[PDB]
Amino acid sequence: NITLKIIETYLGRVPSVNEYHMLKSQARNIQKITVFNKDIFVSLVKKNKKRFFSDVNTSASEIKDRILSYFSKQTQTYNIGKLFTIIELQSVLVTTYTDILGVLTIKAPTSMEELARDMLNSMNVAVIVSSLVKNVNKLMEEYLRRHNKSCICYGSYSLYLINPNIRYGDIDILQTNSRTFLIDLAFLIKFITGNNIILSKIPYLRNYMVIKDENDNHIIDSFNIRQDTMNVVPKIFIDNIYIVDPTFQLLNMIKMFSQIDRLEDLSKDPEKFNARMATMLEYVRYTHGIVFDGKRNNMPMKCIIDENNRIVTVTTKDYFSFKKCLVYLDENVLSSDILDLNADTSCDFESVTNSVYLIHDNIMYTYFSNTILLSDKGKVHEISARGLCAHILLYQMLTSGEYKQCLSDLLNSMMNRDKIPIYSHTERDKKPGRHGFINIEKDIIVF
Amino acid sequence: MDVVSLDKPFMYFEEIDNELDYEPESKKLPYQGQLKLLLGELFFLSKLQRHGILDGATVVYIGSAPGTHIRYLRDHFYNLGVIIKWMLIDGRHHDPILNGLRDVTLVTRFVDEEYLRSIKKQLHPSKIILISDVASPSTADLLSNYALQNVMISILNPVASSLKWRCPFPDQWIKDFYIPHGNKMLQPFAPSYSAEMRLLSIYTGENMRLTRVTKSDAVNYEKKMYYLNKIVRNKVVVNFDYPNQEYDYFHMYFMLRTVYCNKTFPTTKAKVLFLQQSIFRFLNIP
Numbered sequence: 061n062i063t064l065k066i067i068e069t070y071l072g073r074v075p076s077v078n079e080y081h082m083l084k085s086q087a088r089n090i091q092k093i094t095v096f097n098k099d100i101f102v103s104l105v106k107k108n109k110k111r112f113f114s115d116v117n118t119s120a121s122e123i124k125d126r127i128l129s130y131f132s133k134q135t136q137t138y139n140i141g142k143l144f145t146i147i148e149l150q151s152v153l154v155t156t157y158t159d160i161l162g163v164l165t166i167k168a169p170t171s172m173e174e175l176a177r178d179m180l181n182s183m184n185v186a187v188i189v190s191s192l193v194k195n196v197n198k199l200m201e202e203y204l205r206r207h208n209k210s211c212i213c214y215g216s217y218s219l220y221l222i223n224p225n226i227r228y229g230d231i232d233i234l235q236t237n238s239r240t241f242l243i244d245l246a247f248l249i250k251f252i253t254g255n256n257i258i259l260s261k262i263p264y265l266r267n268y269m270v271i272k273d274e275n276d277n278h279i280i281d282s283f284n285i286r287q288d289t290m291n292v293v294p295k296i297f298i299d300n301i302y303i304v305d306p307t308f309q310l311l312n313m314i315k316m317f318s319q320i321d322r323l324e325d326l327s328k329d330p331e332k333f334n335a336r337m338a339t340m341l342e343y344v345r346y347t348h349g350i351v352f353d354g355k356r357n358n359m360p361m362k363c364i365i366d367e368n369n370r371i372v373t374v375t376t377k378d379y380f381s382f383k384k385c386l387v388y389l390d391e392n393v394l395s396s397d398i399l400d401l402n403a404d405t406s407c408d409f410e411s412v413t414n415s416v417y418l419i420h421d422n423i424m425y426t427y428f429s430n431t432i433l434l435s436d437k438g439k440v441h442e443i444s445a446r447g448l449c450a451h452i453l454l455y456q457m458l459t460s461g462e463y464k465q466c467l468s469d470l471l472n473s474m475m476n477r478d479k480i481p482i483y484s485h486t487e488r489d490k491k492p493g494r495h496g497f498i499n500i501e502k503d504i505i506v507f
Numbered sequence: 508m509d510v511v512s513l514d515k516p517f518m519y520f521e522e523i524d525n526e527l528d529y530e531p532e533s534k535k536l537p538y539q540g541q542l543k544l545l546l547g548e549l550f551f552l553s554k555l556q557r558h559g560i561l562d563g564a565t566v567v568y569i570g571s572a573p574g575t576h577i578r579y580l581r582d583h584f585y586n587l588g589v590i591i592k593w594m595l596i597d598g599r600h601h602d603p604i605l606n607g608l609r610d611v612t613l614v615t616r617f618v619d620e621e622y623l624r625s626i627k628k629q630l631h632p633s634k635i636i637l638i639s640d641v642a643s644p645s646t647a648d649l650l651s652n653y654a655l656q657n658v659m660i661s662i663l664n665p666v667a668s669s670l671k672w673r674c675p676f677p678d679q680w681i682k683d684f685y686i687p688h689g690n691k692m693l694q695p696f697a698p699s700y701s702a703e704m705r706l707l708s709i710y711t712g713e714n715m716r717l718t719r720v721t722k723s724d725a726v727n728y729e730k731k732m733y734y735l736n737k738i739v740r741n742k743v744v745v746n747f748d749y750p751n752q753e754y755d756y757f758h759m760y761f762m763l764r765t766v767y768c769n770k771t772f773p774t775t776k777a778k779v780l781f782l783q784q785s786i787f788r789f790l791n792i793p
Contacts, residue, residue, distance in 0.1 A: 085607030144609035236769075239588055261590060263634065267562055284588050287769055392666065395558040396709040399690055402519055404550075404765050408557045416558055492666070493563055494633040496590070505609065507563055507592050507633075 063087050070094055070147075072135040082140055089151045093131070096154040102127050104162045109252045111164070112199040113192075116252050126251045133503075142503035149500065152243045160207075160237075160244050169205040169300035170223075172345070175352060175475070176338040180330050182477035183317055183443060188327045190277040192249065193229065200231045200280070205300040210236045212295055212302035214309055216336065221298050222306065223339045230281065234293070234304070234411065238269050238284035245280070246271050246500065256501045263493025266411045283411040293412060294457050306343040307467075308457055311450040313337065314470070318447030319430040320485055341471070350468045352475060359473030360445030361466075363387075367438055370486065374448055376424065379466045385424035385452055390489045391415070394427045409458055417455045426451065432486040441482060446470060512746040516758035517735060520691035520704055526730035527737055534698045538790045543696045545576040545786060547705050548638060550692070550762040551669045552580060555636060556589060557765070560666055560709070565592040565633040567626075567663060569618055570641035570671075572597035578604045579789050581611060587767060592633070594626070623662040630663075637665040646675040650684055660687060660715050672706035674720060674728040688716035693735070695758035702732035748776070759783070 067075040067083050070090050075083065083090065102124050109116060109123065134146050197217075204213055215232035235241060246257045249271070257279070259271045267284040285293075294305035313336075316322045326333065344350050362375040370389040377383045388394035398406055398418055406416040406425075418425040428451060433441035440448075449470050456463035496507035517523050536542070555561040561584070571577060574595060584591055592610055595601055598617040605611055616622060627635075639656050642648075656670050672691060675681065689708030697703060708715070744757040763779045772778040787793065 082607050085604070141609070144607075148609050237588065239590070261563055263563055266559055267588075267590075286587060286767060287771060288767065291771075390711075391559065392709060392711055395560065396711060398558070399554070399707065399709055402522065402690065404518065404554060404761075406557060408559070410559070492632065492634050494565075496563060507565075507590050507610075 066090050066094070070134055072132075079140065079143070083143070083147075086144075086147055089147060092154050093147065093150045096131075098128060098131055101153070101157070104158065104165065105248060105251055107165055108161055108199075108248055113195045113252050116195070118252060118254070122254060123251055126254060130251075137503065139503075145503040145505050148505070149243065149247070149498075152240055153247055156237075156240050157244045157247075160241055161203075161248055163206055164199070164202055167202050167206075169208075170338070170342050172341050173334055173338045176334045176341060177330075178476065179474040180326070180333055180337060182474070182479055183323065184326045184330050185443070185479040186320075186323050186327065186482045188324060190273045190279045192253070192273065192279055196245070196249075196280050197229075197231050200233070204231075204233070204302075208297075208300070208302050210290075211241070212290070212293070212304065214304035218298075218303040218309070219306065219336055219339045221301070221303065222343065223335075226335055226339065232281070234283050234285045234290070236285060236287055236290055238267065238282045242269055242271050242280075242282055243498070246498070249279070250500060256499075258497060258499055260495055260497035261507060263495060264491035266414060268411070285410055285412070289409050289412060292409070292458050305457075306340045307348070308454065310340040310344060311453050311457070311467070313340070314450035315430060315447045315454070318428075318433060318444040320433070320482075321431075323443075323482075344467075344471070348464060348467075350464070350471065352472055354475055355469055355472030356475070357469055357472075359449075359469055360440075360442055361449055363440040363445040363448055365432065365434075365438060365440055365486070372428070372432065372440065372448065374445075374452065376452065380424075380452075380456075380462070382419055382422055382424045385426060385448075387448055387451070388425070388427045389432065389486055391427045391429075391491075392489070394425060398425060407455070407459070409454075413451070413454045413458070415451075424452070426455070429488060431488055433482050434484045434486075435480060436483050439483075441480060442473075442477075443480075446474065509742060510745045510752075511739075511742040511754075513744055513757075516695075516744075516754065516761050517693055517739065518758075518761065520693060520728075520731065523693075523731040523735055525734045525738070526727070527734040529729050529733040533700050533737070534696070536696065536792065538792055539696050539698075541576045541790050542786065542792060543694050544640070545579060545790065546696065546759060546762050547692060547694055548576070548580055548669065549583065549766060551638070551705070551707060552584065552636075553766050554707075555667055556584070556587075556767060558709070560634075561589055561591065561636065563590045563634065564636045564666070565594055565630055566636045566638065567594045567596070567630075567665070568638040568640070569596045569659065570639060571595040572599040572601045574605065575602040576790065577611075578602070579786070581605075581608070583766075585610070587769060594630075596626075618659075620658050620662070623659055627663050635663050635665040637663055637668040637670075639668065639670045641671065646679045646681045649673065649675050650681060653684055653686060657685070657687070657715075657717070665710070667709045668707075670706045670708075671703065673701075673703040674725045677722055677726045677729060680722040680725060683719055683721050685717040685719050688718050693758070695755045695762070699740075700733070700736045702728060702736075750780075756783075 066087050137143050211233050213233050216228035217231040220226040220228050242259055246259050250257050256274050262268050270281045271279045294308040295302045296305050363372050365372045372387040374385040376385050403418050406418040408416040414429040415427040433444040435441045453463050498505050594612045596614045687708045689706045692705040692707050740754050742754050743752045744754055747757045760779050763782045764775050
């Protein structure tokens with residue numbers, strides 16, 4: 061009885077033979093959906109709207125209808141696959157919204173621009189969007205203070221909280237519940253801006269997801285990360301928010317300059333990175349007590365590419381317990397070999413490092429993910445050797461190991477350098493997969 | 508008495524360092540077969556999770572019925588936020604606790620070269636993870652099953668596979684064959700004298716690196732495995748601080764220590780105790 065009644069009420073008709081056989085196992089969730097107080101929900105949506113999208117050309121009735129209209133579309137849906145979608149997405153709203161966006165009701169919680177310019181110029185060594193974003197960013201500002209444990213910021217905004225003379229548009233975050241937050245956000249927007257929003261998952265990116273408007277205009281990105289990772293990610297408390305330690309972000313930047321696309325964007329407008337770089341260098345200088353002074357003293361730990369096997373060997377004995385590091389340029393290959401070594405313990409940090417790290421019979425095994433620049437025939441360009449050190453250093457910090465001497469030396473080695481032309485670069489490995497998505501008005505989910 | 512102390516349990520066939528001559532003379536747990544499958548696939552999928560390959564993947568399981576345990580795998584990764592699309596193909600029907608889920612597609616069809624091509628054109632360009640537990644056994648049956656598994660891989664071109672791997676007995680040899688290169692994962696809670704293992708592979712991009720299996724290899728298999736099942740598996744691992752020191756739980760411990768959890772635990776032993784209980788409570792194994 062209970063099953064049939066529940067389903068009969070939700071669908072607004074006697075469950076058909078097939079509909080009852082399928083939905084029968086959803087009865088529980090379906091109940092929560094039916095019982096859910098829409099009236100309260102409609103209010104929170106309005107309060108959220110007035111506070112973060114006050115300027116959104118709308119008047120209550122419109123919103124109220126959209127919402128009620130949605131929690132009832134099951135009623136006019138006869139395709140079973142569409143039905144599962146509606147019940148899945150209704151469930152995310154019935155079970156999470158209040159805690160994620162609802163809570164947002166009563167809001168509660170330098171001079172080295174010089175040195176930066178130098179390092180940047182020496183690196184600029186080579187041959188050369190929704191209106192809803194202000195609103196979403198103001199919301200994320202409050203969101204980050206109310207969700208210190210599940211959400212944490214990195215990038216421009218983060219550095220902007222340390223030095224206001226930093227522009228910023230996209231507020232970048234890592235979360236333990238990306239899928240949910242974004243679905244809730246997608247819905248909130250959809251309900252306020254009557255016309256559809258689409259979120260999609262990008263392959264070749266680790267646990268990434270974006271919400272775009274009706275016209276493909278990026279609204280906001282996010283990376284899902286598991287508690288394990290969130291816990292070991294080097295963070296700092298600033299303005300009731302968690303920020304990825306600037307020190308760690310500095311290392312990522314070094315790693316990224318190895319990517320051709322980065323250097324290319326650099327030559328477009330060098331001054332961009334100056335302000336960011338400058339801020340991060342100051343933080344390290346002041347916080348860790350690092351001094352700058354042509355302290356190149358054995359920098360590029362020394363890298364050598366194995367052209368045919370797409371493996372770069374990094375001598376690391378003058379810094380770490382392990383003698384060398386084998387940096388693979390093909391993830392699948394690295395994974396296959398680690399499996400050949402019967403190593404079921406590799407340290408993984410998902411999006412943060414974009415690779416696993418393994419230390420076997422005293423050797424480190426890892427993958428890079430960025431292009432590898434070359435000075436000449438078979439020679440790693442200092443920008444990549446330097447980029448390779450940063451990658452390895454990320455691991456040290458994530459494991460609270462030794463990481464100051466070389467971080468200092470690495471940074472100094474970037475000083476008073478001569479632009480060195482790029483002879484060539486390796487191509488990053490192809491990362492296959494489907495571009496999945498969630499089309500709410502079409503009741504479709506494909507991954 | 509017959510107890511023992513080891514650094515680690517035997518995880519893969521190549522680690523078994525001894526052999527005994529098989530004896531034509533030689534399980535005691537309910538749903539043990541389900542626990543066996545559960546652990547090995549949880550271990551498999553988990554490894555793939557760890558190396559970034561599971562995310563956003565479509566998992567194709569052929570010969571999945573009844574597959575009760577899969578509901579546990581699905582719920583496990585679902586709650587971890589790992590995006591996965593499950594596709595189960597079997598000539599027979601699966602457990603109904605798998606129906607009524609958007610992320611899992613149940614197919615009741617006997618697969619053949621023809622059908623495989625079709626679902627690949629359908630799935631593409633999705634990244635495919637293959638799990639084969641197909642069957643019919645006689646050596647002739649096994650060879651046909653293995654030949655079929657090789658067509659699957661070549662058709663679906665999965666990024667990784669877990670295949671049922673049991674070498675034909677030397678005394679029942681027919682001819683030599685080829686299987687995908689990979690690690691041969693041993694299975695805890697497998698029948699008392701089963702020599703069945705799980706061939707784990709992570710592919711590159713060209714060949715599926717086929718290696719030949721001979722009657723001589725079939726003999727080593729039988730020996731090593733008889734030694735494991737007969738000697739090793741029947742021991743109590745005295746240096747294993749756990750409610751159950753049976754070797755099988757020791758082997759299970761090292762598989763579960765690699766599994767991921769949203770819930771935080773002080774020690775690894777607390778995590779394992781949690782997972783085992785969850786697993787047994789689910790499989791309804793006291």
